[PDB]
Amino acid sequence: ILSTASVLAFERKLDPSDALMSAGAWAQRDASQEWPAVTVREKSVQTVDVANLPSDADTLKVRFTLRVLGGAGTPSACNDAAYRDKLLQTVATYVNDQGFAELARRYAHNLANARFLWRNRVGAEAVEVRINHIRQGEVARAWRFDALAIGLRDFKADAELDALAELIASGLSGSGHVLLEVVAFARIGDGQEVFPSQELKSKTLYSVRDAAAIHSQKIGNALRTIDTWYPDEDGLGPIAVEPYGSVTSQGKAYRQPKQKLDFYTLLDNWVLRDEAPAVEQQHYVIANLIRGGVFGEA
Amino acid sequence: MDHYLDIRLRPDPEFPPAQLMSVLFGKLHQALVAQGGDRIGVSFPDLDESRSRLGERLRIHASADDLRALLARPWLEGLRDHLQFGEPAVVPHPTPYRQVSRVQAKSNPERLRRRLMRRHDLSEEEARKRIPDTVARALDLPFVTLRSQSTGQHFRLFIRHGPLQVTAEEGGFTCYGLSKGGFVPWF
């Protein structure tokens, strides 16, 4: 029969740390070690929470660590062992078809452009991303990208980029452990208001310990924005890899289930009836398996 | 004033287009502060008056050299992903002209009360009896929201397009692209 398992929990791959922010000056980012972090402040307008840079700063210092785990096709809790074996065979067949080539390149793009800087990148005239490869506590290999050249819409190539792509692909395959400290540097302006992820004093801004921060799941949703294989209209760029391709800004869901392009129909075509989809659709399927989920029937 | 440039906000899965309009308006305000001049117009081509919606495009009316200096200004960095634009082409000839105005409001009675402390030195109860709480103005016009480097408070800038006349009038433009007496073509 080979039905879908009743429980199909998948862990998140590419675990993001809780991204802080901090303030400082451009051309002092080489000495960006003891930079003072911005703080959530209550201001009476009714009182609301605001976060902004001080007077003697124009650059943000969003820092988070990303861990590439591997074993993307392996579920954490699968009800059926035959379905788990068939799905592992299908994911391994995908790996022999391509060894996490395009997915790691697009994830290296979402690292390379500061899409994790959601609203801290729109008003910035100079955005910079620094990625250190921490291995046994030391910087194995450093990278210093530029989000101005690497656009948020097109999907290009660059040599250090491909180096980051092979590193993320080796992490996703399982041939090693990849831990990347990513520090952003956006010239948002002198004392301009920044946008941390907001907690729910009508509205509060989330922090960790005397220092404002961005949520991990915001960084994860920014990293998942590789999906361009949806039936795109009206000139929309990449969307986040979600089940049934939904975006909150447009209020609509691409990859509609009335079409045969949502993630679950592509899974049941790929691993149950052996109807292998296109290369782009299986790229999207493996990206959704990388992000994790609670997949399964009821 | 003869040339126009249409900047259309490319849709974003992260932001509704109102914040893109606000960011573009602040960036063009900074560009107009840095450049100087008052022959630079601002319009809204798909301005629907049904729900006071701004639309999804923006129109800039200026000369050839002024628009060339505007594109040569580095204000456009960081906005190429969210916006797309053509070239500073000329406007069509049979185009009726309308004006654009910034209509502010006295939405805070307490601000005017604090003003009247600084002009007549009256008491708080004299301010409350002279100015009640019903003096707040509700304005049903399209608007963008902005913050300033000089004044850190977040302010709303209402934009209103005037009646469609038949000719243009010689007038200047503000740093926001709004008219202090100027006119822009409509097409």
Brief overview:
Chain B: Belongs to the CRISPR-associated endoribonuclease Cas6 family. Cas6f/Csy4, subtype I-F/Ypest subfamily. The structure is cut from a larger assembly and holds chains A (298 residues) and B (187 residues). Chain A has 298 residues and is an alpha+beta fold.
Molecular structure report:
This is part of a larger assembly, with chains A (298 residues) and B (187 residues). By secondary structure, chain A is an alpha+beta fold. Chain A folds into 2 domains: 1-11 and 72-99 and 226-298, no CATH class; 12-71 and 100-225, no CATH class. Chain A is built from 6 helices and 20 strands. A 5-stranded antiparallel sheet of chain A has the order 2-8-12-10-11. Chain A has a 3-stranded antiparallel sheet with strand order 9-1-20. In chain A, strand 10 and strand 11 form a beta hairpin. The longest helix of chain A has 17 residues, at 81-97. Chain A is globular. In chain A, 40% of the residues are buried. Chain B has one domain: Alpha-Beta Plaits (2-Layer Sandwich). Chain B has 4 helices and 10 strands; from the N terminus they run βαββαββββααβββ. Chain B has helices at 17-35, 64-72, 109-120, 124-130; strands at 3-9, 41-43, 57-62, 83-85, 89-90, 97-98, 100-102, 143-147, 154-161, 184-185. In chain B, a hairpin with a 6-residue loop joins strand 8 and strand 9. Chain B starts with a strand and ends with a strand. Chain A binds chain B through residues 52, 118-119, 121-127, 148, 151-153, 189-193, 225, 234-240, 247, 249-250, and chain B through 10-16, 19-20, 23, 26-27, 74-75, 77-82, 84, 147, 149, 152, 154.
